Design a protein around this motif. Structure first.
Motif, PDB file in Angstrom:
ATOM      1  N   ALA A   1       1.778  -2.288  -5.233  1.00 44.66           N
ATOM      2  CA  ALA A   1       2.034  -3.567  -5.873  1.00 44.66           C
ATOM      3  C   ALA A   1       0.727  -4.346  -6.011  1.00 44.66           C
ATOM      4  O   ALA A   1      -0.025  -4.470  -5.040  1.00 44.66           O
ATOM      5  N   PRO A   2       0.422  -4.881  -7.198  1.00 49.72           N
ATOM      6  CA  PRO A   2      -0.861  -5.585  -7.358  1.00 49.72           C
ATOM      7  C   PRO A   2      -1.035  -6.750  -6.401  1.00 49.72           C
ATOM      8  O   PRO A   2      -2.162  -7.015  -5.958  1.00 49.72           O
ATOM      9  N   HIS A   3       0.045  -7.458  -6.068  1.00 51.89           N
ATOM     10  CA  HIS A   3      -0.069  -8.579  -5.141  1.00 51.89           C
ATOM     11  C   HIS A   3      -0.634  -8.118  -3.806  1.00 51.89           C
ATOM     12  O   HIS A   3      -1.526  -8.760  -3.240  1.00 51.89           O
ATOM     13  N   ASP A   4      -0.125  -7.000  -3.286  1.00 48.72           N
ATOM     14  CA  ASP A   4      -0.641  -6.471  -2.030  1.00 48.72           C
ATOM     15  C   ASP A   4      -2.103  -6.074  -2.163  1.00 48.72           C
ATOM     16  O   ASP A   4      -2.899  -6.295  -1.242  1.00 48.72           O
ATOM     17  N   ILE A   5      -2.477  -5.482  -3.298  1.00 48.71           N
ATOM     18  CA  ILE A   5      -3.868  -5.093  -3.505  1.00 48.71           C
ATOM     19  C   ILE A   5      -4.771  -6.314  -3.404  1.00 48.71           C
ATOM     20  O   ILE A   5      -5.766  -6.315  -2.671  1.00 48.71           O
ATOM     21  N   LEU A   6      -4.425  -7.382  -4.126  1.00 49.59           N
ATOM     22  CA  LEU A   6      -5.236  -8.594  -4.064  1.00 49.59           C
ATOM     23  C   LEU A   6      -5.255  -9.169  -2.655  1.00 49.59           C
ATOM     24  O   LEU A   6      -6.307  -9.584  -2.158  1.00 49.59           O
ATOM     25  N   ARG A   7      -4.097  -9.197  -1.994  1.00 49.28           N
ATOM     26  CA  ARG A   7      -3.997  -9.851  -0.695  1.00 49.28           C
ATOM     27  C   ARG A   7      -4.810  -9.117   0.364  1.00 49.28           C
ATOM     28  O   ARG A   7      -5.406  -9.749   1.243  1.00 49.28           O
ATOM     29  N   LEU A   8      -4.849  -7.788   0.301  1.00 49.57           N
ATOM     30  CA  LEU A   8      -5.428  -6.994   1.377  1.00 49.57           C
ATOM     31  C   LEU A   8      -6.843  -6.516   1.085  1.00 49.57           C
ATOM     32  O   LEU A   8      -7.704  -6.592   1.965  1.00 49.57           O
ATOM     33  N   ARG A   9      -7.114  -6.023  -0.122  1.00 53.22           N
ATOM     34  CA  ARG A   9      -8.436  -5.512  -0.463  1.00 53.22           C
ATOM     35  C   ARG A   9      -9.341  -6.568  -1.081  1.00 53.22           C
ATOM     36  O   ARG A   9     -10.508  -6.675  -0.692  1.00 53.22           O
ATOM     37  N   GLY A  10      -8.838  -7.352  -2.032  1.00 55.20           N
ATOM     38  CA  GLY A  10      -9.617  -8.436  -2.599  1.00 55.20           C
ATOM     39  C   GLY A  10      -9.496  -8.566  -4.103  1.00 55.20           C
ATOM     40  O   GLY A  10      -8.788  -7.788  -4.750  1.00 55.20           O
ATOM     41  N   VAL A  11     -10.189  -9.555  -4.671  1.00 57.00           N
ATOM     42  CA  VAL A  11     -10.129  -9.779  -6.111  1.00 57.00           C
ATOM     43  C   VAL A  11     -10.727  -8.597  -6.861  1.00 57.00           C
ATOM     44  O   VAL A  11     -10.170  -8.130  -7.864  1.00 57.00           O
ATOM     45  N   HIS A  12     -11.875  -8.102  -6.399  1.00 54.59           N
ATOM     46  CA  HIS A  12     -12.496  -6.963  -7.063  1.00 54.59           C
ATOM     47  C   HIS A  12     -11.566  -5.760  -7.060  1.00 54.59           C
ATOM     48  O   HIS A  12     -11.462  -5.041  -8.059  1.00 54.59           O
ATOM     49  N   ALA A  13     -10.861  -5.537  -5.951  1.00 57.09           N
ATOM     50  CA  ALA A  13      -9.955  -4.397  -5.874  1.00 57.09           C
ATOM     51  C   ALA A  13      -8.846  -4.504  -6.913  1.00 57.09           C
ATOM     52  O   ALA A  13      -8.554  -3.538  -7.626  1.00 57.09           O
ATOM     53  N   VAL A  14      -8.219  -5.677  -7.021  1.00 53.02           N
ATOM     54  CA  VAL A  14      -7.087  -5.810  -7.932  1.00 53.02           C
ATOM     55  C   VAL A  14      -7.550  -5.734  -9.381  1.00 53.02           C
ATOM     56  O   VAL A  14      -6.892  -5.108 -10.222  1.00 53.02           O
ATOM     57  N   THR A  15      -8.681  -6.369  -9.705  1.00 50.74           N
ATOM     58  CA  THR A  15      -9.174  -6.279 -11.076  1.00 50.74           C
ATOM     59  C   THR A  15      -9.540  -4.843 -11.427  1.00 50.74           C
ATOM     60  O   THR A  15      -9.230  -4.368 -12.526  1.00 50.74           O
TER      61      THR A  15
END
Ligand SMILES: [Mg+2]
Ligand SMILES: [Zn+2]
Ligand SMILES: [Zn+2]
Lengths: 50, 99, 309, 49, 76, 1154
Positions: free
Chosen positions: F995-1009
DNA sequence: TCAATTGTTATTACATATGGTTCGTGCAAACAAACG
DNA sequence: CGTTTGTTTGCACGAACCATATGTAAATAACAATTGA
């Protein structure tokens, strides 16, 4: 309006009580009139063409 | 079909449909996006304010063109005024700040 | 369960009361009579009231309990007969006025009938109340069923014409012509045309135009009360040309001509008013303006002005 | 009369005759439509039909 | 004559200012308050203004300086 | 003029202030003389005169009497336009609840009173009583009775008892309540309660109360006691032809409301029984809701026809509402439309405009020139001359349009290049002539397509067209840097034919003195167009700046290539014209010309290429005949062998060895193999089989088959189509998805039997329906993308940030899907880029990596580079030019003001029809996957706890940090790791899509983008589309525009308040001036639909999605919309702050901040 | 605190009183002709 | 520039003729909200 009443007075013309609403050929269309039909209401008096 | 000026719709002071009322083309939302993507701000403004809706704007634009002075006084489109009077026709008080 | 239909709620709230029992209406009318009798005793038992009555008699020829007993037995009677209104109100369901509006109008008629009903006649209440309820419902239909209201006499004329046209449709076979109705009816045959021409219900501006497109009727109606740009430019050019032409005239002649018409000022002034201002005879000003017009008529001075025609 | 005229004149299943051809006329006469009163609608027809 | 505007953009820059300044100069021309600084080749005022910009004879700096000088000499 | 738009609840006093009178009757017109009947819905006294400066009765018909009110009728004398501005009002005899504030879901009235909507509806329709501070003895305020309870308490309580019915009771409750005490009590409850559901409910309630009290709104105003009346001209009652009248439904709704109000007044006067009055009040309420919404009440009331009446709200919302049909898009004057032809003689910067169309569009200009030159004394004379089309009018028209651009626009404007400017050339016809090279940009073919022409009027508009839209200025795609004016089909065929070489052609081997010699030779017929000859050719090189060193040599080439060399501009190598010049070669040649020489040489080169290609394609005489589709001689043998295999396997299935499904799959496999063999044999027989001799035995050369030349050169068609023409057309799959076991063996050269044609139609109709129903959702996605990113402009020149994202070539399966060259081209380095050996600075920190730097990086084999991205930019309300990049449409860095958001949205959306697409829609909506991947919320040692029906609780313990976080993991979710392990933050515990929300929450902005861009780019690459990542990063930045305050601390924010990220960033920056900051946040991530719908400007939000919710929220909250946005400024008809209007808006802000 | 269901959003008729409208007339005002 | 004579129009004033108002009869998908386990 003013400055038009003045013009009518100057050139002694009369403002017509009837406006032109004649049926004109649509712009661009150019053809020959092949048929004319006239439908007159019962009470009305038929014209010369009718 | 081409149109410089002609009859305007009743409620919204805008041109009419296609070639039967001698109306103008629809500059849809996507065309507005295309203009926005360009830097064309004045083109867009005149497209949706003077050429279409501003009742005082378009007569002045016509006169200005007639004497070769290509300039516009944009003003406020009439459709926005209709929208304001229509929201205000609900129980909502919408107005323009810093008049 | 639950519902949002107002008519359903009205039917629920009204169906609670039992309809009636014979001799019940006579008893209720008796109670109303006793209440008004109490009010009449109260008004009679006020000496000031009797003195005022005597004074008004001379001029012409020259108190809660009773009301409560009146309001009560009026709620009961109307509430008991509410079913009657609905029965004879459903007859006019689709005459341009909604069902509940007809129900309410019939209800008002029913209260009027109850107020004017007389029990001593030994007559059933339903027969008397039906007249009033039908009257109220049909008058409401005539008065507030059309966007362009038309009067009651004209609605009666239209209904008579419709009824007679329907009858002649079957008695004849295809249709009655407006002249043909001048015989079955007794109207000059010019009124018949007017009645038939009486505008029907206006078309909704949102009627989807043919071919099922997203275009409505309102998208094909133009603003007639608009000034074309060409006409406005012509008016401005004419104003400028008139200003220029009047500039090339004598000060007093230009002034009098400008005043005689509404030229860039308020209402035009009459020869008497300009004479008041110029302190000269009216006929003098008439001659001055005639000479000014003659000068303006001189060619090489108004060619553009005639071009403005 | 009102019912019959409403059906024949103003209804989805009675349209102006396509008359710019003999073929157009004949192919319009023998046309099968799933729309109209009692059928689907172009807005929510679905691919399966 | 005018086909592309790449040299004028190189002069003024940023591709929105180039439009505003050209419009200002062309409007000065259209109203009878100015005359071309380049030989007119039967071009419209907009194209003439763009050619002026191309030659470097007109900039947003030059236009305001000329306006200020005209205002200052208007006192007489 | 006005700086902002304020929207708030309308008080009864305010509504009365708006009104110029009270509508007292439902009458509209007098039915005999159609003057308005007063004082009804159309009244002269209230709403103004019907004729300009003409009093209704007829005692005042002069402009002089303006400003006075008559006496015989009381009608003011003024302009008729005032009819559109005057409002009336209706004094409701019973308060009625405003439908919007009652049925908004959440209901504002219900939420404010903490009363369920069901109960409030019960109260409004007079189904149940509600106590109103009816004593603090036995019944609570909010307590609701019914007839039974109310009757029982009536005798039991006479005084200190207040239970009412209908909207009056709701108004009493709203007016009695005091917001401050309720707010304080709810704040105490929230601070003294521990439950997420109750916490959220209390939070919503407190937010509503705080918004209501901070603004000037009063709760009782939610109950309408005065009803405003729309001005008559906005609900016209005009007469149609033939005595028929056209009316707006608003007239009917207003008439119903007035009728019921008057009837209620009558009933109250007569003192009717409570039942009748209650029914009348119900009816009046229902009429009011019908007027306001004509919905939210079960059944919408219809008019004379069986169609629902259009409500007051219906005219604002929806695709057909005011916002989208008349504010964002309008019909336009000075516009035309016509069919488009080819007209290949044009230059790239001009279009052919029909004479009649030009005359009609440019009428005012013609009048002006006629008056100025003295040929017409008055404007009417000029109009007469133009109508007569006198000879001099044509000369005047030619003068008018000498350098006046016009805008050519095709119906679906998918991207920027859908509108372009041209210099018209008058045509004696009726069809617009369009330069062939712009068809690809327009996506226009010449099978009946129509294009609209718009005339820019003002000087600014003309200069914008000349300097921004001119077809010469738009030759590179705004999505990718590739050229967009590549010659398409006929030009490509001509160039390919004139460039390829034969083996034994007339005049082979002779030596020529130059391209002119070659052209003379070919045109005189002494040499074949393509004969291998030696020719002296002079190349020009631009090694250093400016200098063009001439290099002369004897090149081994053909006559045709030498001829084509004349067209090439100076500073290009001769190697470009020494190949077969397919479509790809021509595009590469044009790109090289643009990147070396500039823009003007590229335009001239494109025009010359078009002309030469057309001419030599004509001279080629390339035609298609039946013999050109050659069927392989092995097709019959291959199909016979395939049928033999099929029969063998069918027999084996009959023998009971393999199930029906496996036999079906194997038959499919063998048929696919046979089809591949047939296609390969066809291509072998059709591509090079042309065999001829050169003064010797025999040689082999690429075939000159017309179909093959069309396919190979890239003009039209592809190997798939060629095999469908000659070889068998593979296997057809029924629309369900199953592949038909019997494949269509017949090609199209030989006939298809009835069954094969039926099977082909099975799929053809499916494809047609799919493409018909595909553009709608692609258009919807483009609309959402534009709305989320419309308010995004390059406001700064350099943010100065050092953060960036590390771009690396994408490799999946050991093979590169996209090299680093294309991914780092045109982007500004974020950090200094070192050699892999750390030897020295290869490029400075903030250099724009143009093609030379990219070649340097490729030569040094730099695997990874860290470049600035729009998602990491530190600017507020926009982004610096250095973070964006190159402005792919041009070559130079992005200018200040360019609306990059709209460009990105259009670039992403215009290829949607090539798509799958729902995958991209889900990615941008940020939809969570159905079975997501449970990630490691925190770093530490993992452990297990309770494992009963309440599924397993997983505990991760940090080395030193507290571990209150325990994850309820379902048992049926296979654990990737063991119980006794240690995991890192943002690692994978379960298995599934992330889920993208988890990606942003755990890895960071660079990870989700990175995740979003990689996924969407994988989709597009799979479909063959090319989109630069700048646009996807822009969309991601707009998606990450909101943040939640984890710890307000010393700031002015709450905890659960979801503030705009820019506001909190500025607040933290300013609080840094002080010591206390205590401001920390967690970046949210919303879908484009959600992010766009939650924005500062309520006008932009109310414009595109559900208008009722946005308007109700803005009204209750008392929002004040500072425009500062493209949508808002477009709506109010003001210069958008993006392009040429950016300077104007900056100056306006300058004047405002004083 | 989950999970299924619900709702919202997007592509008659007759009598009587009075009242307004139409029509004809008169007077003074306001033009229009022709001289001195 | 005024004077005498003659002509048309704008208000105002009856008269009457019809018009009006009033009364009287005994698909699909997605996303929150709400209710129930
Ligand atoms: Mg096409
Ligand atoms: Zn008046
Ligand atoms: Zn930046």
């Amino acid at each position: 309006t003013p400055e038009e009443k003045l013009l009518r007075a100057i050139f002694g013309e009369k403002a017509s009580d009837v406006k032109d609403s004649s049926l004109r050929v649509p712009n661009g269309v150019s053809g020959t009139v092949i048929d004319v039909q006239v439908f007159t209401r019962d009470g009305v008096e038929k014209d010369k063409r009718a | 079909h081409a149109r410089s000026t002609g009859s305007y719709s009743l409620v919204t002071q805008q041109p009419l449909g296609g070639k039967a009322q001698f109306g103008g083309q629809r500059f849809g939302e996507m065309e507005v996006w295309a203009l926005e993507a360009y830097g064309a701000a004045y083109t867009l403004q005149e497209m949706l304010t003077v050429k279409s809706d501003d009742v005082n704007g378009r007569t002045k634009m016509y006169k200005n063109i007639v004497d070769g002075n290509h300039q516009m006084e944009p003003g406020m489109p009439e459709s926005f005024n209709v929208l304001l009077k229509e929201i205000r026709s609900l129980g909502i008080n919408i107005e323009l700040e810093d008049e | 369960g639950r519902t949002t239909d107002p008519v359903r709620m009205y039917m629920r709230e009204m169906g609670t009361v039992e309809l009636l029992t014979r001799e019940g209406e006579i008893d209720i009318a008796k109670r109303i009579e006793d209440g008004i009798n109490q009010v009449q005793c109260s008004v009679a038992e006020y000496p000031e009231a009797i003195t005022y009555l005597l004074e008004q008699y001379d001029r012409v020829e020259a108190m809660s309990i009773g009301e409560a007993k009146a309001r009560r037995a009026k709620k009961e009677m109307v509430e008991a007969n509410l079913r009657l209104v609905i029965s004879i109100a459903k007859k006019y369901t689709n005459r341009g006025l909604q069902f509940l509006d007809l129900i309410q109008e019939g209800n008002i008629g029913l209260m009027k009938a109850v107020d004017k009903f007389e029990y001593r006649r030994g007559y059933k209440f339903s027969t008397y109340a039906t007249w009033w309820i039908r009257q109220a419902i049909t008058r409401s239909i005539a008065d507030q069923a059309r966007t362009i209201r038309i009067p009651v006499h004209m609605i009666e004329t239209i209904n008579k014409l419709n009824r007679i046209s329907r009858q002649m449709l079957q008695e004849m076979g295809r249709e009655p012509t407006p002249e043909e109705l001048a015989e079955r009816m007794l109207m000059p045959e010019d009124k018949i045309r007017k009645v038939l021409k009486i505008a029907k219900e206006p078309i909704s501006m949102e009627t989807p135009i043919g071919d099922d497109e997203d275009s409505h009727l309102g998208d094909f109606i133009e603003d007639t009360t608009l000034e074309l740009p060409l006409d406005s430019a012509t008016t401005e050019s004419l104003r400028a040309a008139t200003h220029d032409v009047l500039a090339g005239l004598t000060a007093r002649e230009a002034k009098v001509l400008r005043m005689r018409f509404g030229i860039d000022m308020n209402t035009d002034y009459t020869l008497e008013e300009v004479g008041k201002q110029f302190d000269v005879t009216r006929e003098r000003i008439r001659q001055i303006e005639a000479k000014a017009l003659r000068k303006l008529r001189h060619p090489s001075r108004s060619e553009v002005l005639r071009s403005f025609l | 009369s009102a019912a019959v005229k409403e059906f024949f004149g103003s209804s989805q299943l009675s349209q102006f005759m396509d008359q710019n051809n003999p073929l157009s006329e004949i192919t319009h006469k023998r046309r099968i439509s799933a729309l109209g009163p009692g059928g689907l609608t172009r807005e929510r027809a679905g691919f399966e039909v | 004559a005018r086909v592309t505007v790449q040299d004028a953009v190189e002069k003024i820059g940023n591709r929105f200012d180039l439009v505003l300044v050209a419009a200002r100069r062309a409007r000065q021309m259209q109203v009878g308050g100015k005359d071309p600084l380049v030989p007119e080749e039967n071009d419209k005022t907009t194209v003439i203004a763009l050619r002026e910009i191309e030659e470097g004879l007109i900039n947003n700096q030059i236009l305001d300086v000329r306006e200020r000088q005209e205002q200052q000499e208007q006192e007489a | 003029e006005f700086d902002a738009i304020k929207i708030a609840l309308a008080s009864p006093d305010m509504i009365r202030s708006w009104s110029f009178g009270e509508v007292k009757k439902p009458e509209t017109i007098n039915y005999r003389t159609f003057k308005p009947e007063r004082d009804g819905l159309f009244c002269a006294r209230i709403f103004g005169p019907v004729k300009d400066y003409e009093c209704l009765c007829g005692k005042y018909k002069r402009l002089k009497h303006r400003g006075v009110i008559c006496e015989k009728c009381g009608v003011e004398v003024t302009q008729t336009k005032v009819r559109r501005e005057r409002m009336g009002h209706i004094e409701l005899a019973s308060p009625t609840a405003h439908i919007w504030f009652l049925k908004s879901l959440p209901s504002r009235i219900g939420l404010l009173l903490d009363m369920p909507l069901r109960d409030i509806e019960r109260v409004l329709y007079f189904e149940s009583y509600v106590v109103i501070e009816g004593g603090m003895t036995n019944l609570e305020r909010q307590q609701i009775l019914t007839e039974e309870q109310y009757l029982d308490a009536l005798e039991e309580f006479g005084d200190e008892f207040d239970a009412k019915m209908g909207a009056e009771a709701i108004q009493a409750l709203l007016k009695s309540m005091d917001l401050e005490q309720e707010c304080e009590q709810l704040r105490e409850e929230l601070n003294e309660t521990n439950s997420e559901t109750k916490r959220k409910k209390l939070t919503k309630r407190i937010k509503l109360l705080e918004a209501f009290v901070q603004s000037g709104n009063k709760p009782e105003w939610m109950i309408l006691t005065v009803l405003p009346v729309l001005p008559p001209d906005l609900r016209p009652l005009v007469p149609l032809d033939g005595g028929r009248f056209a009316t707006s439904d608003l007239n009917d709704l207003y008439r119903r409301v007035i009728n019921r109000n008057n009837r209620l007044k009558r009933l109250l006067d007569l003192a009717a029984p409570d039942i009748i009055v209650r029914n009348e009040k119900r009816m009046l309420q229902e009429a009011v809701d019908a007027l306001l919404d004509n919905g939210r009440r079960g059944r919408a009331i219809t008019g004379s026809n069986k169609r629902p009446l259009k409500s007051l709200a219906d005219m604002i919302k929806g695709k057909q509402g005011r916002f989208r049909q008349n504010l964002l898009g309008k019909r336009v004057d000075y516009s035309g439309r016509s069919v488009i032809t080819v007209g290949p003689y044009l230059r790239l910067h001009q279009c052919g405009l029909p004479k009649k169309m030009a005359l009609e569009l440019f009428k005012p200009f013609i009048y002006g020139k006629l008056e100025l030159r003295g040929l017409a004394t008055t404007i009417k004379a000029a109009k007469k001359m133009v109508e007569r089309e006198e000879a001099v009018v044509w000369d005047i028209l030619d003068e008018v349009i000498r350098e006046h651009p016009v805008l050519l626009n095709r119906a679906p404007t998918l991207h920027r290049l859908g509108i372009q400017a041209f210099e018209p050339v008058l045509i004696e016809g009726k069809a617009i002539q369009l330069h062939p090279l712009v068809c690809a940009a327009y996506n226009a073919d010449f099978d009946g397509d129509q294009m609209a022409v718009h005339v820019p009027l003002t000087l600014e508009a003309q200069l914008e067209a000349r300097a921004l839209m001119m077809s010469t200025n738009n030759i590179l795609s705004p999505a990718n840097g590739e050229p967009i004016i590549v010659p398409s089909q006929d030009v490509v065929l001509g160039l390919y034919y004139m460039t390829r070489d034969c083996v034994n052609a007339k005049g082979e081997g002779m030596v020529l003195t130059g391209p002119k010699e070659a052209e003379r030779l070919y045109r005189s017929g002494l040499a074949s167009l393509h004969a291998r000859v030696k020719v002296r050719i002079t190349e020009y090189e631009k090694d250093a700046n400016g200098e063009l060193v001439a290099k002369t040599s004897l090149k081994d080439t053909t006559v045709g290539r030498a001829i084509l060399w004349m067209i090439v501009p100076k500073g290009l190598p001769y190697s470009i014209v020494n190949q077969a010049l397919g479509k790809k070669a021509i595009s590469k040649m044009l790109n090289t010309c643009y990147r070396i020489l500039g823009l003007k040489p590229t335009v001239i080169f494109a025009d010359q290429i078009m002309y030469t290609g057309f001419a030599y394609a004509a001279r080629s005489g390339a035609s298609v005949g039946i013999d050109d589709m050659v069927i392989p001689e092995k097709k019959h043998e291959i199909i016979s062998e395939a049928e033999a295999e099929v029969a063998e396997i069918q027999e084996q299935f009959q023998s009971g060895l393999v199930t029906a499904g496996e036999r079906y799959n194997k038959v499919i496999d063998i048929w696919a193999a046979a089809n591949d063999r047939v296609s390969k044999a066809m291509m072998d027989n059709l591509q090079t089989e042309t065999v001829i001799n050169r003064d010797g035995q025999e040689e082999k050369q690429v075939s000159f088959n017309s179909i093959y030349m069309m396919a190979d050169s890239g003009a039209r068609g592809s190997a798939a189509q060629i095999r469908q023409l000659a070889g068998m057309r593979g296997l057809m799959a029924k629309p369900d998805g199953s592949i038909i076991e019997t494949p269509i063996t017949a090609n199209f050269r030989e006939g298809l039997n009835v069954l094969q044609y039926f099977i082909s139609t099975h799929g053809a109709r499916k494809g047609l329906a799919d493409t018909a129903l595909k553009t709608a959702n692609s258009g919807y996605l483009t609309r959402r993308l534009v709305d989320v990113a419309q308010d995004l402009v390059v406001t700064e020149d350099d943010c100065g940030t050092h953060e960036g994202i590390m771009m690396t070539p994408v490799i999946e399966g050991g093979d590169v899907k996209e090299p680093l060259r294309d991914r780092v081209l045109g982007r500004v380095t974020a950090e200094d880029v070192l050699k892999p050996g750390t030897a020295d600075i290869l490029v400075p920190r903030n250099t724009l990596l143009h093609e030379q730097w990219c070649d340097l990086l490729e030569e040094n084999s730099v695997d990874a580079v860290k470049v600035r991205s729009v998602v990491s930019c530190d600017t507020d309300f926009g982004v610096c030019a250095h973070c964006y990049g190159r402005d792919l449409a041009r070559g130079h860095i992005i200018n200040k003001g360019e609306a990059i958001g709209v460009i990105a949205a259009q670039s992403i959306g215009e290829p949607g029809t090539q798509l799958g697409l729902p995958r991209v829609a889900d990615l941008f909506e940020a939809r969570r996957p159905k079975e997501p991947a449970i990630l490691a919320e925190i770093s530490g040692i993992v452990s297990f706890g309770k494992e009963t029906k309440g599924k397993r609780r997983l505990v991760i313990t940090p080395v030193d940090g507290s571990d209150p976080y325990e994850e309820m993991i379902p048992k049926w979710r296979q654990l990737n790791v063991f119980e006794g392990e240690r995991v890192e933050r943002g690692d994978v515990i379960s298995d599934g899509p992330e889920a993208p929300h988890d990606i942003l929450r755990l890895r960071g902005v660079h990870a989700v983008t990175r995740y979003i861009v990689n996924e969407v780019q994988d989709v597009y690459r799979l479909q063959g589309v090319k989109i630069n990542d700048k646009h996807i990063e822009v969309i991601v930045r707009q998606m990450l525009r909101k943040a939640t305050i984890v710890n307000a601390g010393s700031s002015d924010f709450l905890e659960g308040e979801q503030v705009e990220y820019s506001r909190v960033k500025i607040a933290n920056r300013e609080l840094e001036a002080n010591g206390k900051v205590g401001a920390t946040y967690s970046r949210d991530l919303l879908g484009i639909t959600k992010a766009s719908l939650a924005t500062e400007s309520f006008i932009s939000a109310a414009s595109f999605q559900e208008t009722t919710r946005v308007l109700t929220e803005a009204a209750v909250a008392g929002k004040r919309d500072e425009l500062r946005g493209l949508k808002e400024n477009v709506i109010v008809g003001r210069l958008i702050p993006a392009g040429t209007g950016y300077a104007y808006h900056q100056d306006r802000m300058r004047r405002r901040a004083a």
